[PDB]
């Protein structure tokens, strides 16, 4: 994290982790679209010609005030696709909370597994334990006809019972509720 007693502001880093085309940038775009122009910064998206995230998406939220503190939440999304691992692992610099965006398509349940595993590897290499970090999981793409059932998707991705939220990113369903969950967890009085 980062406290600023003299400035009276709190800064936290949240990272959306997930395989390719699983909806991280979509989460952030929807968030930016429905946030008052007063409490949000510009949405930066280091993307390629194809619209896939090339380094990261970054979105600040000058959100409300804690016990008088300013509170600023820094949303990040990684490149996700496999061959950008080099860059992906960099986004977890001073990560304070994680959101795992799982693609609920059946074809990409394997890639979901691989991406969660890459997540654990990269956090450990960064000096973080996935079970120790505040982290939430999202089951994106709940609008598809053959989207894997929520239960059978938890069995494969959520053995430890961390908060799960079903979402349809483009529409925004589940998006802000996911962000709220991650934020409430990140706010550590411990
Ligand atoms: N069917 C369905 N498609 C979705 C949903 N959310 C996002 N998509 C689509 O999937 C594609 C991937 O979205 P995108 O936002 O680029 O994912 P990403 O995680 O940022 O992809 P990357 O950065 O790892 S490469 C987009 O074309 C988007 O429209 C959803 O909830 N349901
Ligand atoms: Mg993206």
Numbering used by the authors: 2 to 191
Authors' description from the paper:
A hallmark of all motile M. xanthus cells is the accumulation of MglA-GTP at the leading pole where it activates motility, while MglA-GDP is found diffusely in the cytosol. This localization pattern arises due to the GAP activity of MglB, which is located at the lagging pole where it inactivates MglA-GTP and depletes it from this pole. The ability of MglA to hydrolyze GTP is essential for motility regulation. To gain insight into the structural landscape of M. xanthus MglA, we determined the crystal structures of MglA in different nucleotide states, which uncovered that MglA can adopt three conformations: inactive MglA-GDP, active MglA-GTPγS, whose structure had not been determined before, and an unusual conformation combining inactive and active features.
Next, we determined the crystal structure of the M. xanthus MglA-GTPγS/MglB complex. The complex contains a symmetrical MglB dimer and one MglA-GTPγS molecule, as previously observed for T. thermophilus MglA-MglB complexes. As in unbound MglB, the C-terminii of MglB are disordered in the MglA-MglB complex. Both MglB monomers interact through their helix 2 with switch 1 and switch 2 of MglA, which display active conformations, with one monomer establishing additional contacts outside the switch regions. The MglB dimer does not insert any element in the nucleotide-binding site and does not interact with GTPγS directly. Overlay of unbound MglA-GTPγS shows that one MglB monomer would clash with the arginine finger loop, a conflict that is resolved by a large lasso movement of switch 1 (11 Å at Arg53). This rearrangement positions the arginine finger near the active site, which it could reach through side chain rotation, and it completes the canonical coordination of Mg2+ by the conserved switch 1 threonine (Thr 54). Thus, MglB recognizes the active conformations of the switch regions and contributes to catalysis by reorganizing the arginine finger loop through steric conflict. The organization of the MglA-MglB complex is surprisingly similar to that of the complex of the Rab GTPase Ypt1 with the TRAPP complex, a yeast RabGEF whose central subunits have roadblock folds. The slow spontaneous GDP/GTP exchange of MglA was not increased by MglB, indicating that MglB does not function as a GEF under these conditions.
